[PDB]
Design a protein around this ligand. Structure first.
Ligand SMILES: NCC[C@@H](O)c1ccc(F)c(OCC2CCCCC2)c1
Ligand SMILES: NCC[C@@H](O)c1ccc(F)c(OCC2CCCCC2)c1
Ligand SMILES: CCCCCCCCCCCCCCCC(=O)O
Ligand SMILES: CCCCCCCCCCCCCCCC(=O)O
Ligand SMILES: [Fe+2]
Ligand SMILES: [Fe+2]
Ligand code: NA
Ligand code: NA
Lengths: 504, 505
């Protein structure tokens, strides 16, 4: 949890427009940047929160800004460029808001790729959650091209959280007009042709409502299984095809709770196991893995069926601290939960707990109607203290048994700390300084590491305190979240959502 | 959690018949028995697990045995007598099982068991051993002699009452019982100047409704604050149609209803029509209930699932070897300490939102369009088949009020093998544990000059069947850190005990 109030209101600098740079700046290093840390921290976020006098209203509306911290021989540079999307280009051309954003109507689907960036073959794509992804140059931060996924596969959109296997295979999920389709983009072959042109639907998940698909932000992947969590946050397609924005089309199903779904990855087949539990919002899967014919499903949950995005309008996030805390009082409560999904359902065990694993308090009750009612093991819970934007040692422990998760700590939705969670012991570590607003921590392994947490986490920190530089790149030891170094920059950095470390 | 396996199988001594004593034994003290500790630890449990060749099958079948540890000037005595119930007396007379027990049918109208093996509580100047039926047994707390059988049906409209009545500081007794369908709160007043039996002044103050017209839920305990009564209606139902059958045969699980929580106004004696709903669990023990700015804080010892946990408490299963005991518990409901927060002020304008605006909890209450209030708990403690059970607090000063500390018996796949302290604010835990040592419910006794909530000791009866030890002992831990203060060792075995009290003298 946080041990800090924010009466000075410095967090408002997260949602303040910035200018892009023409070339990279030098970042003043204090401490020692590890000499094995060679590459680029690439991160996406909103950078432009108004077009002249026309404001953007929601956190997910601001125009995509691609950030880069370069590391080499203990030196750090910072660079940022706005992504030349249709949304941005046409806004600069017409000097107004042309494309409708998530929570801002224009008076044409948005390609404002402000959420994440991920590799496909030798290429990198900035993305939002629509059919449009933007190819970008990871060295120059130049916009290369717009890609429409609808040209290649049957999906109306795809999440900003595709899973990436070690061979370079990309998995993602998207709504299809109703079902949810898993897209598979293969690795780059010898022919050297665009892997997106070889895209295909491998498996389809069914929908709880014939005309209303659930909002899906992420999904789980193991070597053998795909996990999809269908939440009570529904998209109303009747309202969708009608001065409306995307937010206007969301509603909450009060009765359905949460439906969990598993598919066989290798046999490309949906499994008809009716996993059921109480209602929550879900944005981020932490990790999924297999343990003796059980799926371990670690989730960042929000307890309630009301859409958490309702609390992320810029007007509310820009209020003074006492008003920010009051606004969050009736919001869903954040909670890290472990669900255990049994793969072997024997009818003879009807009415009993199927979770026979010795190291969990998670339960799965087989009912007479063949629904499997799940109760979670709670890994972390703090009052309006969200362990969010979860990261692991993905390359080695993604989809596999693991111990450690890293997270951005939200204090009534304000990011004010970095967190480490041992998911076996439930022990936590916290890094926190006053009036300091960090980003998602990204784990980088020591290249010769045998241990899970042998490396560093990188976070971009906004520090608007009068006796400090506006922002800095923070490097913590992954072991205990003890500070290793900072790279301070002389310009402000807005909020960033997701990114990756590109090793060079 | 426990850090110990039990391959030696010493826990079998919990379920082994013992003989009563004619007079108290001396208990060999090691350490220092507090000199301010003056009175009697009275505890109830099964003592006779067979009548000749006829066995009792369930944990709650063995014949009531009343235990007493007396403390005075740093010295300890131990005494035990079987309660002379109809069940016990007629069993000794006919040399067979005469009365049907919870999980044991008797073979030659309906003769209900008065086997008071569960708890003992004060009413006026009297003490009553009880089970969960209409029959409670008046006992002499000094001699452990059986005085009388009392039928609650002679006084108030209930078919039974729990072994967990709440007792206010003035001596007022509250309890809950099924009535053929509703659940009735019984109020027994304090002893008046006229000096007449307070039970003859018993009355029903408020009635809770039933989810099923013909099937009442099993109720083991309930919550009480200065202003409110809290009742938790679980999916464990009693089938009155089915009611050579025993009590266990009549229980079934409602798969769809989950848990319904109910509040009544204590002082206005009126049921509040707030439809609190959550996921299915078994509930035996409320920890404590209190009021916080028009919210009820409801701390519960839960079992996650709708299957009846009592299904796992047959003596044949509890007497198996350790690896088989652990295997048997694998598919059982998982124990979990949960805090539920019940909003008292429901505004329709907050429909679809979390009503729990308290700043120090992650518990939620969602107001739905059908006016049901869906609850999610704050989990205070969770360990794999590691139950924090038989909860106790500083009851006299913090019962029904804001509090920090609970004490518990730790169950390891249903085997009691440790004592636990839980800070319900910080979720910090303390554990006392020795190998091949099987403790009882810890009972808190305050230091007479206590300033803090946990200024005192907990008393536990420990079965230690290890060859290089005496069979059993009275354990005294410091309530602060559960550090050992003293033991009073006895040279005879003690079976499992469920509940009791410290009677100050
Ligand atoms: N990252 C938080 C949300 C943000 O990225 C966002 C921006 C714009 C959106 F349109 C959007 O809705 C996704 C829909 C796209 C059409 C099919 C149904 C889902 C989400
Ligand atoms: N504490 C463990 C249970 C044990 O004390 C026990 C023994 C005997 C019982 F008959 C019994 O059932 C209670 C019923 C009594 C009739 C009305 C409906 C509830 C419970
Ligand atoms: C660094 C962000 C701070 C501002 C408020 C953040 C609230 C996050 C709520 C839960 C996660 C929702 C998804 C956000 C990231 C994404 O779009 O992928
Ligand atoms: C000291 C007890 C050990 C034997 C097994 C105990 C299992 C208890 C399960 C949960 C509590 C059920 C109620 C038992 C006490 C009572 O009858 O009041
Ligand atoms: Fe995300
Ligand atoms: Fe009990
Ligand atoms: Na600090
Ligand atoms: Na020990």
């Amino acid at each position: 949890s946080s041990q800090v109030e924010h009466p000075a209101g410095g967090y408002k600098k997260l949602f303040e427009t910035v200018e892009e740079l023409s070339s990279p700046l030098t970042a003043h290093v204090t401490g020692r940047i590890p000499l094995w840390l060679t590459g680029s921290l690439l991160r996406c976020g909103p950078g432009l929160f108004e077009v002249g006098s026309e404001p953007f209203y929601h956190l997910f509306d601001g125009q995509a800004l691609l950030h880069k911290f370069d590391f080499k021989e203990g030196h750090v540079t910072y660079h940022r460029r706005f992504i030349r999307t249709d949304a941005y280009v046409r806004a600069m051309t017409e000097k107004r808001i042309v494309i409708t954003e998530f929570g801002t109507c224009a008076f044409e689907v948005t390609d404002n790729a402000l959420v994440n960036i991920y590799p496909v073959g030798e290429d990198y794509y900035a993305c939002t959650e629509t059919n449009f992804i933007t190819k970008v140059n990871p060295e120059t931060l130049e916009t290369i091209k717009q890609v429409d996924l609808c040209n290649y596969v049957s999906v109306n959109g795809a999440t900003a959280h595709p899973h990436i296997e070690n061979d370079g295979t990309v998995y993602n999920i998207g709504n299809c007009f109703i079902a949810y389709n898993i897209v598979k983009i293969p690795p780059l072959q010898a022919d050297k042709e665009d892997p997106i042109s070889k895209s295909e639907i491998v498996v389809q998940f069914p929908c709880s409502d014939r005309f209303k698909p659930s909002y899906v932000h992420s999904f789980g992947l193991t070597p053998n299984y795909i996990v999809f969590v269908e939440t009570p946050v529904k998209i109303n397609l009747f309202k969708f095809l009608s001065g409306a924005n995307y937010m206007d089309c969301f509603e909450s199903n009060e009765t359905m709770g949460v439906w969990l779904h598993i598919a066989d990855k290798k046999r490309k087949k949906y499994i008809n196991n009716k996993y059921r539990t109480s209602p929550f919002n879900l944005f981020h899967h932490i990790n999924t893995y297999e343990d003796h014919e059980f799926l371990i499903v670690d989730l960042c949950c929000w307890k309630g069926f009301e859409f958490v995005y309702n609390y992320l309008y810029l007007a509310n996030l820009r209020e003074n601290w006492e008003e920010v805390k009051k606004n969050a009082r009736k919001a869903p409560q954040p909670e890290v939960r472990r669900y255990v999904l049994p793969l072997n359902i024997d009818k003879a065990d009807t009415g009993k707990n199927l979770v026979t694993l010795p190291n969990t308090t998670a339960t799965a009750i087989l009912c007479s109607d063949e629904t499997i009612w799940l109760e979670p093991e709670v890994l972390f819970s703090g009052p309006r203290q969200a362990f969010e934007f979860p990261q692991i040692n993905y390359q080695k422990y993604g989809g596999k048994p693991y111990t450690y998760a890293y997270g951005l700590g939200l204090n009534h939705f304000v990011p004010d700390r970095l967190c480490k969670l041992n998911v076996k012991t439930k022990e936590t570590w916290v890094w926190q300084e006053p009036d300091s607003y960090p980003s998602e921590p990204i784990f980088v392994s020591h290249p010769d590491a045998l241990e899970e947490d042998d490396g560093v986490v990188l976070s971009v920190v906004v520090s608007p305190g009068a006796g400090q530089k506006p922002a800095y790149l923070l490097i913590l030891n992954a072991k205990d979240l003890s500070e290793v170094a900072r790279a301070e920059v002389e310009i402000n950095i807005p909020v960033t959502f997701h990114g990756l470390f590109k090793k060079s």
